[PDB]
Design a protein around this ligand. Sequence first.
Ligand SMILES: [Cl-]
Ligand SMILES: [Cl-]
Ligand SMILES: [Cl-]
Ligand SMILES: [Cl-]
Ligand SMILES: [Cl-]
Ligand SMILES: [Cl-]
Ligand SMILES: [Cl-]
Ligand code: NA
Length: 129
Amino acid sequence: KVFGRCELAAAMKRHGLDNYRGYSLGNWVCAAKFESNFNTQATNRNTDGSTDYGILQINSRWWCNDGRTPGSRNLCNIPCSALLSSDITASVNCAKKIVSDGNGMNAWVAWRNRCKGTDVQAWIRGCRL
Ligand SMILES: [Cl-]
Ligand SMILES: [Cl-]
Ligand SMILES: [Cl-]
Ligand SMILES: [Cl-]
Ligand SMILES: [Cl-]
Ligand SMILES: [Cl-]
Ligand SMILES: [Cl-]
Ligand code: NA
């Protein structure tokens, strides 16, 4: 599914991401725009053989099982295919574990390079939340 900006902001707010570990909702919508263009079916292969999955591009090296990342962990205890669903619950729940891992939203390279220290409130401007 390809989300609208305000549609995704509302879904993330309903799932408890607004100010989760101090990151306001605009941060999460900004990360999802630059990671996936708001497309839950996005996948991207890494040089190390791992794959990133879904609207927040969660990596199989640590977070989900795709059965083809040798020596990897499954810290969210899910199949990576669960991260491609139109239902963002599995992606949000895994995102909560990642952002709690010590580095905050710096885990998401596109957040650090494209959202961090910008006016992220612009990503929820005009939305009925
Ligand atoms: Cl947009
Ligand atoms: Cl915000
Ligand atoms: Cl594997
Ligand atoms: Cl594991
Ligand atoms: Cl699995
Ligand atoms: Cl959803
Ligand atoms: Cl932090
Ligand atoms: Na894995």
